[PDB]
Amino acid sequence: TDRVSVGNLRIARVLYDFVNNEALPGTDIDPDSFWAGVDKVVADLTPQNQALLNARDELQAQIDKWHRREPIDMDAYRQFLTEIGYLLPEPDDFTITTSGVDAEITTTAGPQLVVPVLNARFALNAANARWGSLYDALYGTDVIPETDGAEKGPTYNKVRGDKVIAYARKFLDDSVPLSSGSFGDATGFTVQDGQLVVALPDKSTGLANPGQFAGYTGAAESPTSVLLINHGLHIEILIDPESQVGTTDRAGVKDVILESAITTIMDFEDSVAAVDAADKVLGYRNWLGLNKGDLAARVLNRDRNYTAPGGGQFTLPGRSLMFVRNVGHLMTNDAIVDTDGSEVFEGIMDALFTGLIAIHGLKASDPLINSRTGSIYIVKPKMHGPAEVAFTCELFSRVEDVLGLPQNTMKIGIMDEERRTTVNLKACIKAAADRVVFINTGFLDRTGDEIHTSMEAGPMVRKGTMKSQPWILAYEDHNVDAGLAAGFSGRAQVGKGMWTMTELMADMVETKIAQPRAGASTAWVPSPTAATLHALHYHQVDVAAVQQGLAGKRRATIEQLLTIPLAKELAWAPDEIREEVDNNCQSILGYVVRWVDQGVGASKVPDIHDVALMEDRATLRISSQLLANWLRHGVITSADVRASLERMAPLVDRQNVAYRPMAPNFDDSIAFLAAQELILSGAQQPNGYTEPILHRRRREFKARAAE
Ligand SMILES: O=C(O)/C(O)=C/C(=O)c1cccc(O)c1
Ligand SMILES: [Mg+2]
Ligand code: NI
């Protein structure tokens, strides 16, 4: 591969050209001194990046030996963990000082959307998911069940449409109540002397809380829409008797529009497959078009115009406020190598290049696309403990100097998704006291790190049992406590994890309310549709109140956090073990095959119960680590795993279209071998991470497809 020499670095030409021709134009940064900054940061910061990675292994190996050397004594285990410096002293109370953050993060509680940056349409829809149609969300999914009468089909079904309408009217009643009567019986809306007036058949009523009236469009005496607010989220009733739905409605309502994905995370990490310069350029380019505003497949929303209750004009943001998730400290990428052929740390690159690109979002498009307060929002995943957070800080300060940006311009969304972070979370937050804009429980990764850390102690409970183990319940509460106690209320997001069941929206609406009821001012959804249905929860839960009631609680002990999810003796019949194995192998195989063969890093994979699951590297990190733990402790044999992989593989072949089967020549299929390796090599991956194998096998496939 052809490279450009800058100092000690050899930069892949496609990446060199991309920065110079596309990313640097318009930033007033001088290209020669940008690259000089790249060279200088790489050389100054690569050693400690590597030292931190060595500390991980050195710590895991001590813990390994300790478990090998009989009901686990917690007091001894605490003190060993403290002594090897795993468990560090909790610092004294403090308050974060992160300033210049936008209202969508400091103040608004609402859904947060994660989307793979390499898919421009997905990324486009996600940036546009700030507003979404409630009707579409209910008509298109199973929130409205398809009992007799209400089935979707080729044409519009009015029995279903009616239930959609009745559902939305009750949401209005429950969110923006009338002084008397129900939106179900409304026949019209007008604005009289700056106040909302709803016409019932007998009388007429106003709002039980007139402050919930935020504006309108059209003439005040028969507006084209009425705009409400509740818990800081906007609700827009679209009024159009002319339209098909509008004609049938007792008040001519066409839709209820919900402000939904308040912020969106454009993902470079677990939900994309990017193994060289060609791949990273594609991601960087899409991130560039998002920040310049001209990304198009279909284009980015402009803000929305309203008339205030008094008759003046105002505007509301039409776009999700955009985070970008960089990769973490682990991997390297040959998009840059040095003189010796050593690859450059990929995370360092993401900070330089996603940060460079982000500057366009602070500046007028073609009107400022992203942060009006002047911040750049970078999620930093998969950090292990407070020193690794301080490293990320040091990297962002050095990249700011290279880019010419005020110090602390680059904010950090801290993932709490590694065990050494969990049990040191307070010190991890303090380590970023003036950059941190959220903490979030990345429970999937956190579950993979739970299995790997304690890989030597014994067999683990089944995957489906993890969700209710004491360590994770402690971890979710301990994350809220640490957030609230560092002054996150009004300052930074307290965020929880992802709903993976992409077609079970009835279930999501019924159960995911637990997250705001637990004091989380945001949580993760995988589609704009799911963002819309998840907004409902924030209208029913007063997260501000919930957080206020939780201040000063400390609800998890370090003992509970350290409670390893060991399986109790002989808990499983032959058929239950088989199901776990089979299921784990199916999901692994389904995800890996599109990863290695097509470069898709996030796939909907049905499971053994045919539930469609949105899989990314974290869910793969759980399934691979679990089977490696069962294999390590004799729960299954190597014959079982190879048998199960061979069994599930044709099933995966069948579920797939411009695609290459894995059966029957398993030993020919790079995708099959990668899958096999994740399991049989699983205990030897650093912290169970799946990237090392996925990258090598993706690069392996790319080379084969080119000969
Ligand atoms: O729990 C975590 O560790 C975490 O980071 C979650 C994800 O990245 C994610 C994104 C899309 C789909 C999915 O299933 C998971
Ligand atoms: Mg994660
Ligand atoms: Ni309320």
Q: Is the CB of 189 under 6 A from ligand 1?
A: no
Q: Is the CB of 523 under 6 A from ligand 1?
A: no
Query: Which whole-number Å values give the CA distances from 168 to 120, 135, 255, 533, 707, in the listed order?
Result: 31, 8, 9, 11, 57
Question: Which residue's CA is minimally distant from atom 15 of ligand 1?
Answer: 616
* Buried b / exposed e along 20-39 (16+ C-beta atoms within 10 A): eebbbeebebeeeebbebbb
Distance separating alpha carbons of residues 429 and 438, to the nearest angstrom: 9
Which distant-in-sequence residues (6+ apart) come within 8 Å of 138 by Cβ? Answer: 144, 164, 167, 168, 533
CA of 454 to the centre of ligand 1 (A): 22
Q: Is the CB of 448 under 6 A from ligand 1?
A: no
DSSP 661-705: ---S-GGG-HHHHHHHHHHHTGGGSGGG-SHHHHHHHHHHHHHHT
φ/ψ region of 552 (left if φ > 0, alpha if ψ in -120 to 50, else beta) reads left
User: Ligand 1: which of 122, 265, 270, 476 to mutate, most ligand atoms within 8 Å of CB?
Assistant: 270
Distance separating alpha carbons of residues 633 and 566, to the nearest angstrom: 12
What size, in residues, is the chain? 707
Note whether 482 and 439 are within 8 A (CB).
yes
Q: Which of 122, 240, 213 is nearest to 531 (CA)?
A: 122
Q: Respond yes or no: is residue 446 known to be catalytic.
A: no
Q: CA 543, 326, 293, 289: dihedral to nearest 10 degrees?
A: -150
Distance separating alpha carbons of residues 335 and 353, to the nearest angstrom: 12
- What ranges make up the beta strands (E) of 468-588? 493-498, 522-525
Q: CA 44, 47, 49, 53: dihedral to nearest 10 degrees?
A: 180
Q: HEC profile for 334-365?
A: EEEEECCCCEEEHHHHHHHHHHHHHHHHHCCC
Give the β-pairing of 343-345 and 376-380. unpaired
Note whether 589 and 675 are within 8 A (CB).
yes
Which distant-in-sequence residues (6+ apart) come within 8 Å of 379 by Cβ? Answer: 265, 269, 323, 324, 325, 326, 412, 413, 415
Q: Which of 370, 382, 411, 417 is nearest to 493 (CA)?
A: 411
DSSP annotation of 45: H
Q: Which of 670, 683, 679, 593 is nearest to 641 (CA)?
A: 679
Note whether 499 and 505 are within 8 A (CB).
no
Q: Which domains are present in the chain?
A: 1-130+260-567 (3.20.20.360), 131-259 (no CATH), 568-707 (1.20.1220.12)
Q: Which atom of ligand 1 is nearest to the CA of 500?
A: 14
Distance separating alpha carbons of residues 120 and 122, to the nearest angstrom: 6
Note whether 378 and 413 are within 8 A (CB).
yes
CA of 202 to the centre of ligand 2 (A): 55
Tokens representing 557 are 């002990």
Rounded to a whole number, what is the largest CA-CA distance in the chain? 84
Note whether 430 and 483 are within 8 A (CB).
no
Q: Which of 637, 635, 703, 647 is nearest to 675 (CA)?
A: 647
Q: Respond yes or no: is residue 420 known to be catalytic.
A: no
Give the β-pairing of 112-116 and 522-525. parallel
* Buried b / exposed e along 544-572 (16+ C-beta atoms within 10 A): eebbeebeeeeebebebbbbbbebeeeeb
Peptide bond just before 31 cis, omega within 30 deg: no
Q: Which atom of ligand 1 is nearest to the CA of 446?
A: 3
Query: Which whole-number Å values give the CA distances from 635 to 459, 577, 607, 630, in the listed order?
Result: 7, 8, 22, 5
Look at residue 333 and give its three-state secondary structure. Answer: strand
Q: Which H or E element spans position 34?
A: helix 31-68
Q: Is the CB of 525 under 6 A from ligand 1?
A: no
Which distant-in-sequence residues (6+ apart) come within 8 Å of 572 by Cβ? Answer: 462, 580, 635
| Burial grade of 207 (CB within 10 A; 0-12, 13-18, 19 or more) | middle
Q: Counting ligands in written order, which one lies closest to the CA of residue 466?
A: 1
Distance separating alpha carbons of residues 609 and 611, to the nearest angstrom: 6
Tokens representing 235 are 């609700």
> Letter for the amino acid at 229?
I
Give the number of other Cβ atoms within 10 Å of residue 11's Cβ: 22
Q: CA 38, 44, 49, 54: dihedral to nearest 10 degrees?
A: 140
DSSP annotation of 184: G
Look at residue 66 and give its three-state secondary structure. Answer: helix
Tokens representing 38 are 């790249």
DSSP annotation of 479: H
Distance separating alpha carbons of residues 690 and 187, to the nearest angstrom: 58
Residue whose pair of structure tokens reads 């410096």 in the numeric block: 85
Note whether 21 and 284 are within 8 A (CB).
no
φ/ψ region of 215 (left if φ > 0, alpha if ψ in -120 to 50, else beta) reads left
Note whether 674 and 275 are within 8 A (CB).
no
CA of 579 to the centre of ligand 1 (A): 24
- What ranges make up the beta strands (E) of 400-452? 410-416, 436-441
Tokens representing 654 are 């069948």
Catalytic residue among 325, 419, 446, 697: 325
Note whether 386 and 430 are within 8 A (CB).
yes
Catalytic residue among 419, 616, 617, 640: 616
Binding-site residues for Mg(2+): 417, 445
Binding-site residues for glyoxylate: 325, 417, 442-445
| Burial grade of 541 (CB within 10 A; 0-12, 13-18, 19 or more) | buried
Q: Is the CB of 500 under 6 A from ligand 1?
A: yes
Give the number of other Cβ atoms within 10 Å of residue 156's Cβ: 11
| Burial grade of 89 (CB within 10 A; 0-12, 13-18, 19 or more) | exposed
Distance separating alpha carbons of residues 57 and 618, to the nearest angstrom: 20
CA angle (665, 667, 672) in 5-degree steps: 90
Q: Give me the phi and psi of 389, to 5 degrees please.
A: -70, -45
Question: Which residue's CA is minimally distant from atom 5 of ligand 1?
Answer: 442
Q: Is the CB of 580 under 6 A from ligand 1?
A: no
CA of 513 to the centre of ligand 3 (A): 15
Q: Which H or E element spans position 371?
A: none
Distance separating alpha carbons of residues 115 and 619, to the nearest angstrom: 16
Q: Which residues pair with 421 in a beta bridge?
A: none
Query: Which whole-number Å values give the CA distances from 440 to 422, 480, 511, 577, 644, in the listed order?
Result: 11, 9, 19, 32, 35
Which distant-in-sequence residues (6+ apart) come within 8 Å of 257 by Cβ? Answer: 131, 132, 133, 134, 235, 236, 237, 238
Which distant-in-sequence residues (6+ apart) come within 8 Å of 342 by Cβ? Answer: 332
* Buried b / exposed e along 481-513 (16+ C-beta atoms within 10 A): bbbbbbbbbebbbbbbbbbbbbebbeebbeebb
Q: Which of 575, 702, 700, 691 is nearest to 624 (CA)?
A: 691
Give the number of other Cβ atoms within 10 Å of residue 311's Cβ: 11
Distance separating alpha carbons of residues 682 and 628, to the nearest angstrom: 5
Which distant-in-sequence residues (6+ apart) come within 8 Å of 32 by Cβ? Answer: none
> Letter for the amino acid at 176?
V
Structural biology method used: X-ray
Q: Which of 699, 705, 468, 500 is nearest to 617 (CA)?
A: 500
Distance separating alpha carbons of residues 191 and 199, to the nearest angstrom: 11
Note whether 530 and 508 are within 8 A (CB).
yes
User: Ligand 1: which of 118, 267, 269, 271 to mutate, most ligand atoms within 8 Å of CB?
Assistant: 271
CA of 366 to the centre of ligand 1 (A): 33
Give the β-pairing of 313-316 and 304-307. antiparallel
End-to-end Cα, the chain, rounded Å = 15
Q: Which of 663, 665, 667, 644 is nearest to 655 (CA)?
A: 663
User: Is the four-CA dihedral 221, 222, 224, 228 of positive or negative sign?
Assistant: positive
Q: Which H or E element spans position 289?
A: helix 277-292
